[PDB]
Design a protein around this ligand. Structure first.
Ligand SMILES: Cn1c(=O)n(CCCO)c(=O)c2c1nc(OC1CC(C)(C)N(O)C(C)(C)C1)n2Cc1ccc(Cl)cc1
Ligand SMILES: Cn1c(=O)n(CCCO)c(=O)c2c1nc(OC1CC(C)(C)N(O)C(C)(C)C1)n2Cc1ccc(Cl)cc1
Ligand SMILES: Cn1c(=O)n(CCCO)c(=O)c2c1nc(OC1CC(C)(C)N(O)C(C)(C)C1)n2Cc1ccc(Cl)cc1
Ligand SMILES: CC(C)CCC[C@@H](C)[C@H]1CC[C@H]2[C@@H]3CC=C4C[C@@H](OC(=O)CCC(=O)O)CC[C@]4(C)[C@H]3CC[C@]12C
Ligand SMILES: CC(C)CCC[C@@H](C)[C@H]1CC[C@H]2[C@@H]3CC=C4C[C@@H](OC(=O)CCC(=O)O)CC[C@]4(C)[C@H]3CC[C@]12C
Ligand SMILES: [Ca+2]
Ligand SMILES: [Ca+2]
Lengths: 702, 153, 153, 702, 50
């Protein structure tokens, strides 16, 4: 009982001694010894040619393992059992062995039953072997849609969920192979776009194997980017990026009509493809159409130029209305010029918002239904243009895509508040027809509500300017990274919201008995916004505000005392407040800082590619001919088969050259990328052993 | 919840600092304790509108140093009625030294340690959460506590 | 090395059984008296052999259960033997990986169902109010096999 | 002008075509071709055997490069020029070539003129080659002390500073070689201790090459640690750690007298050596002498045991005096028991400090010269013991080492304050004899000063407890790391100190005109510690305090206003205060956080070794029998070379076995650690080429 | 039965995962060099007209 006796618990059938030496000859590369043993086994039947080593590797698997082709034919000529040898040869990636097995054409296996030669070849991503199999009329099962309820999908999931999930992943691994896509895909770039997008969606539905599907999607994105990297001239790049996969759309004269494939890449979120330097360089040429040497100019001439066009925005817009074909009427159509004019037309609007409160007319604070002032009249046309422009996106873009962009949510709220202000101002103008001191106005007076709504819109309008940071090389990358950190912060606010409610309920439950009236308070002021704070925890609504303000240290400690001076109650209430301060300010606040620091490190990895993708969307929104006029001026009122066939022929020629260059580069990159392994050392050793045995056959003397 | 074990260790060092300064401040100020009848509004302590007797007793001193972490203790609590200038300056220097140690040094040290500890925890979050969720799921597989508390009696 | 271990095991070999961590027998106390350094190294060498995945796969009747218990015992050892805590924690992690890797080789739902619902000859009485199935999964939870539980299948 | 013509600017002498083929034969391994060309060179005198490519590599260097020993002998037999071939062979680390060159007997070199065969061999750290050279009576120059002003050191740095610095570093690289130390050092462990310590000091004096010397010092520390790792029994470990290098100097009693080598390692700061698990395990056995199964006990029984021992500390201390040899009088001598008794005797002192203010007697607030109270009398014996114990170390440890420990600075200040309190209390007792209301006491009344000094000591006494965290496995590692972060923070406070002074000068320069009197302030209170803060920036001393308190938000904004209401002056003063807040709270505070986070990451990877070193010092301070009694009770009143020779013989035998095991492990660790290089691939290719030529040579008539 | 199949698959995978480790050591270079040296000596031993 002081020793553990070790024995074989699951014993297999032992291998004879004659077979053991026969296998050793194959490993050593001893062709002569193997030839005699095979020939002897044809008569004596003393050794088993198919001797199953407990590891499962027969002589054939050992011959394939060492890449010894000459011996492989020796065993194959002797009618040895093949079984799953083709898969083992394909995995080893020995072209000679694969051709040999193809030419002629429950046991333990290292492969699952669903793996086929074509699927496994695509998994290895070997261009040469995949070409050999594809030439023999192979096919791959088509996976069903992500959300499929057919009888086969449901029955397979219920019959064997584990095998069903593994089979589907194996198919997608083969389809996502860059070598297979380059060989069998009519449009490899489009195929990589759709395949990578489909895999990203699958990684969400199939959350158990999310990492596997996300790696396949990344592999598809890289392949499309690497194909674009092989472009060698601007003509090749122009052909690729302007290719229309389909026709009969009839397009839209208001649309840009060019860069069709670039737009598809943006739709599928191909950020690396869009951020490619040659693609970016071409885009900058269109963006800076009127400035051939923009990059060579000093930062002072650039800034001076921007102010000149910005101040000239009022008449550039007018020219586009009067004489669009004129020399001056064409400047506004240049994307960068149009962007500056829109920005200038918006900075003017924000300047007038400041002037709203800068002008104060004494004796006019008491008009209940005052009419619009001078500043308000000028602001009105801007607001109508902003509302008209946003509705113009409803009918053009569509309901679904609008809500995706967070900046559109701020645009909707801003326009709704402006509309409410106008309607409220109209009601007050009609309801009241005189002056009255503002001190006697009711809490919900329409004029007071309109002023509050107008002021809230002003904050939203000013914050809109932050979206323009994307155009700047210094601020854009930082602004984009900041917006990526807001989603992680939002998760944290869920835990803090629970803590705030838990303590708010407890504090209000303790203090609601001692609520006092405003008449009994000094200055007749009740609440925490008074000079002497009181009734901090009298009601639940007040308690929530008090705990919010204590986060910034604006709630005084004396609010925990009651008039009756119940010492035990006051101490308990102050301990609840103290415990809340510890949890929120010492623990939760620091946890958010630690979480933010970790998340920012990851975000900083992809800051450049993310910003470039965002700036590309900004630039493309000014290429179109639709919204040329800024908001102030935007409210004033046969057969093409032959042309499409040629466009497709040029695309195919470029795709053919890109694949040729890409395949060579990948075959080149492997021979210098990775170091040697044990399989290489074993292969080299076997080569010498085979040579030694073959040479020793011719013994001059002994 | 995995970060709370590391935070608890750091709370041992802060408690020693809090007790060390609480003893020193109370040892200096307990001579000047005043009665509630002699205070405005008849209110004694730091929860009054005009804070007083912050360091009169050890129990009160511990609360005063706790509240100063959040900036809710006013500076004038370091003054005594007799206006002993040397005593008041020494007491205000103890309070100032405590603020430096707790808010400038110890608070930032906790932040630095939390950032380092969170980085390690973040690489095992998926496996840790899935283990926790498995325990949650398995507690509902049994047919023992099917009825919620309202109906389980 | 699986091949070499098989050759030796076929020749009727044995390994000393380590005593429980908290053992006060004459041998454990006396051995730790004459040579503590050698006693500690001898015990660690035995556990390195027992934690070998190849040996467990070859000589263990129930390799999954053996890896669960062996890895749990090594984690407790890393606490008592704090001088060599890192060595024992690496062995425990090695046992946890082996059990998870064995589960990774399941190729059908039937195989996974058989493994996770296996009872190690409990006999005994089972409470009808309790959950009958997933006996081995519950054992993995008891031994804190987080990687095993978090396996995607 | 549009093309850049490329030409050889620094042209060397060209090599003839006959020599080019002759060198190619050596690289190919063609022994037959090389031999014939050598035969021709003896008669024709057409090719130059000593030919060197502009790279400097002659045939001999090429033969050494490929490790082709047979050819190298072929060239050596032909009287080829040797020059610096031995260094190249040593650098290549080919034992065969080195022996051949040793047995044998304005040019460009890859080695500096100061490099010798023994120095270069030690740089490579090759045990076999170093043994070959050491057997031939080699020597290495002895470097002078770091601070040397001899004629040679000063003159050498004058003639060539660059060469002087490089020569010294080359010597230290050879001396720090683990192979050389193991071969030629009588006591390799002591040699590594001293050599590594000397290199660390050199890395400070040599500012430019600090990194090089720090790596050598780390290499010496690792070697000593690795030698200790080879111990296989407790007897071997005991022999090593208890070895005394010298015995002539008498060893005073009352000391531990054992672990002499361990104490030497602590003196030289060998943290890795001390933290070795086997060394730590042996130390824990001595530390827990009375608890054979301490580690096996539950955390509850451990805590219960500690309380029982601590409460009994008064009784154990008494026994050590009444009956030191008795059964009870021996418990206090166990290091862990003694540590608990000292801690308990200190917790009692801190408890009585609390009782100083918990007890108040009415009418005693006015005694000017009050005598000691009940609590003060009990505290007195503790203080005398603390002062006596600290002086006992100054006359025992020494002035220099005492001040190095930061905790000793707090012990000195604490004892000085306690002494000042006693003397001040005595003066008040003698100078005054009655009771007077405390309100009329002067600012500098002796009783008031004594109370303030006593309270300051109480804070220091309590803070001393933090040093006991080192004994705990959970708190010790964190406490040690926190103390390592304080040195980085101290540098930051230098920049903040200048910022505070810069703004304090500016604010005081602006506000000192408007200073008001206390009589003119409400409640007659002047300063920022009043209920209504005033005179914040009237004086420089006050201004510094005001800016300090604003860091915590305790300075109100209204302190920037003056009575005269000078609007421009007030705005300027508030802008100075605002600018200071931005610099200190928004910029400098966050910079410290960022610096602390980076520095803590580095400290965190060495926390375990640093804590274990600190805990070892704590444990060793209780092994000695000097200060057994806690402070409360510590003031009460023929030829002997055979032992040293035998003790040295056992140490040498153990050292011999440790070196043998270490050398094998290092030779073992190299063959399985690093991958191949171009030198290995080139050598393997040459082997086949040499074999191919030699086999082909065995032919018929050509 | 299931345990037997799982061990068989696991053993093959671990034996497979080592051959693709993507690394080499000096002991491999020493062994490869020795193979050529042994072959060279054996071939040379069969000399002809001496
Ligand atoms: C939540 N909380 C609180 O609400 N108050 C105000 C009470 C009403 O005024 C307190 O004073 C108060 C308090 N937590 C306190 O110590 C905590 C501080 C933190 C950092 C959270 N660590 O980590 C622990 C270890 C949990 C101790 N203290 C101070 C205190 C201490 C002892 C005594 Cl006898 C009296 C006061
Ligand atoms: C602990 N402490 C304090 O308690 N008080 C209040 C006293 C009672 O009001 C202070 O004013 C006070 C203070 N540490 C002070 O400087 C320190 C502040 C810290 C953050 C630790 N760094 O960075 C250095 C550079 C070391 C300066 N100052 C300001 C001060 C300075 C000089 C003079 Cl002559 C007078 C005041
Ligand atoms: C140092 N400083 C200050 O002392 N005061 C108090 C004056 C006396 O009350 C201020 O108000 C004041 C101020 N820096 C201000 O803006 C800065 C603040 C910091 C954080 C440095 N960033 O981020 C920028 C973007 C540079 C703006 N502002 C506010 C302000 C701004 C414009 C105008 Cl016209 C008036 C006030
Ligand atoms: C509330 C209002 C009245 C004050 C704020 C308005 C302006 C002071 C600033 C705020 C943000 C600025 C914008 C931020 C970013 C850009 C992108 C920038 O892009 C480029 O053309 C430069 C790109 C590069 O050089 O990399 C052009 C200026 C512009 C529109 C800036 C114009 C001036 C703006 C509107
Ligand atoms: C009564 C007032 C004055 C407070 C007294 C202080 C105590 C509340 C605490 C503060 C720090 C504590 C010490 C912190 C660290 C240690 C080391 C610790 O070391 C061990 O023996 C355990 C080691 C391990 O288990 O790893 C023993 C307890 C002790 C002395 C603690 C004893 C209790 C102390 C003194
Ligand atoms: Ca919009
Ligand atoms: Ca001391």
């Amino acid at each position: 009982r002081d020793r553990i006796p070790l024995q074989i618990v699951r014993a297999e059938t032992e291998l004879s001694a004659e077979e053991k030496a026969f296998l050793n000859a194959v490993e050593k590369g001893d062709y002569a010894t193997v030839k005699q043993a095979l020939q002897e086994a044809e008569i004596y039947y003393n050794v088993n040619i198919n001797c199953m080593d407990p590891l499962g590797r027969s002589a054939l698997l050992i011959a394939i393992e060492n890449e010894n082709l000459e011996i492989m034919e020796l065993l194959l000529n002797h009618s040895v059992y093949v079984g799953d040898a083709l898969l083992y040869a394909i995995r080893k990636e020995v072209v000679g062995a694969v051709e040999l097995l193809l030419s002629y054409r429950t046991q333990f296996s290292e492969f699952t039953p669903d793996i086929t030669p074509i699927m496994l070849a695509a998994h290895t991503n070997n261009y040469e072997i995949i070409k050999l199999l594809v030439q023999k009329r192979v096919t791959i099962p088509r996976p069903h849609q992500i959300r499929c309820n057919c009888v086969e999908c449901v029955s397979s999931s219920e019959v064997d969920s584990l095998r069903h999930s593994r089979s589907r992943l194996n198919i997608y691994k083969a389809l996502a192979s860059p070598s297979l896509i380059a060989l069998s895909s009519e449009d490899p770039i489009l195929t990589a776009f759709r395949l990578g997008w489909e895999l990203k969606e699958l990684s969400k539905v199939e959350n158990e194997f999310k990492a596997e599907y996300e790696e396949l999607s990344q592999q598809c994105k890289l392949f499309a980017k690497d194909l674009l990297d092989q472009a060698r001239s601007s003509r090749e790049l122009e052909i690729i990026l302007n290719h229309r996969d389909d026709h009969s759309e009839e397009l839209d004269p208001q649309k840009y009509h060019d860069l069709a494939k670039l737009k598809v890449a943006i739709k599928y979120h191909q950020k690396e493809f869009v951020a490619q330097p040659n693609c970016q360089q071409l885009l900058a040429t269109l963006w800076y159409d009127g400035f051939p040497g923009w990059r060579r100019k000093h930062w002072v001439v650039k800034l001076l130029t921007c102010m000149t066009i910005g101040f000239l925005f009022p008449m550039l817009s007018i020219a586009y209305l009067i004489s669009p074909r004129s020399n001056l009427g064409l400047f506004i159509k240049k994307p960068f010029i149009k962007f500056i004019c829109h920005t200038a037309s918006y900075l003017t609007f924000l300047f007038m918002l400041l002037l709203a409160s800068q002008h104060i007319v004494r004796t006019d604070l008491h008009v209940q239904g005052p009419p619009p002032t001078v500043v308000e009249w000028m602001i009105l046309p801007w607001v109508l243009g902003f509302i008209w422009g946003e509705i113009k996106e409803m009918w053009d873009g569509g309901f679904t895509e609008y809500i995706h962009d967070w900046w559109n949510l701020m645009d909707f709220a801003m326009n709704s508040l402006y509309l409410a202000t106008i309607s409220l101002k109209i009601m007050a103008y009609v309801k009241y027809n005189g002056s009255r001191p503002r001190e006697e106005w009711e809490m919900w007076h329409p004029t007071l509500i309109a002023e509050a709504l107008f002021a809230i819109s002003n904050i939203l309008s000013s914050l809109r300017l932050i979206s323009l940071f994307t155009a700047n090389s210094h601020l854009g990358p930082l602004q984009i990274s900041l917006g990526r950190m807001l989603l992680d912060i939002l998760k944290f606010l869920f835990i803090y919201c629970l803590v705030l409610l838990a303590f708010a309920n407890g504090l209000n439950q303790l203090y609601f008995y001692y609520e006092t009236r405003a008449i009994d308070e000094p200055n007749n002021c009740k609440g925490i916004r008074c000079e002497k704070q009181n009734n901090a925890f009298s009601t639940l609504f007040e308690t929530l505000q008090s705990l919010f303000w204590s986060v910034f240290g604006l709630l005084n400690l004396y609010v925990t005392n009651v008039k009756a001076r119940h010492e035990f109650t006051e101490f308990v209430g102050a301990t609840m407040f103290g415990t809340y301060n510890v949890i929120s300010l010492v623990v939760l606040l620091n946890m958010l800082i630690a979480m933010m620091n970790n998340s920012y490190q990851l975000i900083a990895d992809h800051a450049d590619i993310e910003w470039k993708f965002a700036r590309t969307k900004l630039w493309m929104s000014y290429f179109d001919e639709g919204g040329t006029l800024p908001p102030p001026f935007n409210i004033i009122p046969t057969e093409r088969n032959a042309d499409s066939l040629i466009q497709n022929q040029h695309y195919q020629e470029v795709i053919r050259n890109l694949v040729k260059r890409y395949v060579a580069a990948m075959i080149r990159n492997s021979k210098t990328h990775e170091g040697l392994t044990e399989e290489n050392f074993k292969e080299l050793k076997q080569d010498i052993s085979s040579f030694r045995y073959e040479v020793l056959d011719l013994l001059g003397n002994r």
